[PDB]
A paper describes a structure:
There are three parts to the flagellar structure: the trans-membrane basal body that functions as the motor, the connecting rod and hook, and the flagellar filament that acts like a helical propeller. Our current understanding of supercoiling in bacterial flagellar filaments, referred to as polymorphic switching, is based upon the notion that protofilaments within the flagellar filament can exist in two discrete states, that differ slightly in length. The “short” state results from a protofilament having a right-handed inclination (the R-state), while the “long” state results from a protofilament having a left-handed inclination (the L-state).
Therefore, N226Y filaments adopt a right-handed form.
Author numbering:
A (entry chain A), B (entry chain L), C (entry chain B): 255 to 304
D (entry chain V): 52 to 254
E (entry chain f): 52 to 152
F (entry chain A), G (entry chain K), H (entry chain L): 3 to 51
The structure:
Amino acid sequence: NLTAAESRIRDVDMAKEMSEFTKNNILSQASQAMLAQANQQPQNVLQLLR
Amino acid sequence: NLTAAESRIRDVDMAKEMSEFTKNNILSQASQAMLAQANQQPQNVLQLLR
Amino acid sequence: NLTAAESRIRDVDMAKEMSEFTKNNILSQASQAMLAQANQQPQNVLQLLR
Amino acid sequence: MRGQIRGLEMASKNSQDGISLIQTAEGALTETHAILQRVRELVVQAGNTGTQDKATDLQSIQDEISALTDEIDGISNRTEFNGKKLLDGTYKVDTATPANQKNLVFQIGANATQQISVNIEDMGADALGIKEADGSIAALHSVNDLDVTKFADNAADCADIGFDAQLKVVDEAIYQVSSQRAKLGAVQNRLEHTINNLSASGE
Amino acid sequence: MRGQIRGLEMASKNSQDGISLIQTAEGALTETHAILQRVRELVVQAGNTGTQDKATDLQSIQDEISALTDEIDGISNRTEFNGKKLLDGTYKVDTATPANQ
Amino acid sequence: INHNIAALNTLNRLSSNNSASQKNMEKLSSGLRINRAGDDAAGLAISEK
Amino acid sequence: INHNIAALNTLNRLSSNNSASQKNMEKLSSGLRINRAGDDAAGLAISEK
Amino acid sequence: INHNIAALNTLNRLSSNNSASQKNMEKLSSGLRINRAGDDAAGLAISEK
């Protein structure tokens, strides 16, 4: 029972962690994506410039 | 952890650098552009000349 | 034990090597990429030229 | 404004290197824990007198434990981040002379007094303590670790050779290396929340 | 008219810097929240007596919480927009002396 | 507006979500939530004992 | 960030868990916990006698 | 006014912004901010050790 509670503290429910990992990785790829949109804003500033 | 801090010093966050690169490149093309406007000022000086 | 230390010397931890390979390959593709940006600098020099 | 922006990014990097250093120190404290667990186990069985005797078959255990305490001395000495020893008494919390604390002032902000003070100590003598460890007890319960012959003498009622006191002081050592290691995790939380402040305010 | 035009643009920029300052303050309050959540959690389990005892295994939790409160003091002190402390009692709502708001 | 793009927040959400996928990397690849002491000091202080 | 990936921890958890499956390989394939003296010196010192 | 056009500044902003895109070229194509020692000597002096 000590091992049980000790595991409830430290040892992870790796399913939940994996869902958290896939989730956060999507947030990451979404963010890099929004750089791929964000940097594209001043080139249109160059477009009215020319 | 040494590798980590060492990377925080030298190794670049290439996203930020890329945004910096696109940015500065636009400043460059804007500047060449403003040559394309700037040199066009004395030809109108030739226009009142003729 | 001799085989063990001998392997620690010569034989590679292929996981670390693979991460090194993917890494360096990205540095390569990034560099070819920055040729695809770098050579594009004087054509704008031709643009203010015309 | 530029001054505070750039200095605020660099303040972030400062905090981040601080995280790194702390992670190193704490790792040394991890292996410290594992060793002290081994020690505690060796003490429990070595306190299993009646069967664990010959007394030199405690000498052997003693030798092992003494090697482990030598390893605690090792870790406390050789732990270095960029060459800088941490765990040793350089960074005591508070002596009777507070003019010799020598805190771990980290720079955390782009302005004055936006800093964090951190302290750390442990070595072979990291057992129980009041201002110093103690004499016959409370450090050599992490340096000498009795059971050389010195349990077959008496069992529980001597306060310097009894199992209850000895093991209790091992539990103190675990408790306060655990405490020191528990401060610095919270320090890492401080620095993460900080860096979030630094990225926001920076932006 | 020019006076009000230019001063009205500059009034816009004034409001915009005001937005920025507020965003900084509020971010400090974000990390304040996260910390207070941690605190609340530590209190719930620390209120799980019967199993969370030894009482020094609450001392440890106490130490952690005290570190977090020190961080609230930190954030309240070090939060600065262009060097100006905000969260601290400089900007109290209304004292018994409204001459010191 | 050009010399400082306003998607600097994007760098912070990238450097936080990227910073969090990796906390899940260390946390998963050992099975332990208290792999690193900077997740919960209380659980360490108890679990050690 | 690119020239040094932060999943170096992953190499250490691989080189520890991999290093531990094999301690179970030697320890199982002989039946002995003190197959190698570097598991518990005390149990050796007693068990020899 | 004709024999010296006043957009010589334009040549300097071109020869600085052009000069900076290329600092990002060297700095990106190796991943290193201290690719060239003339970015921060301190980070070199520390990072070497």
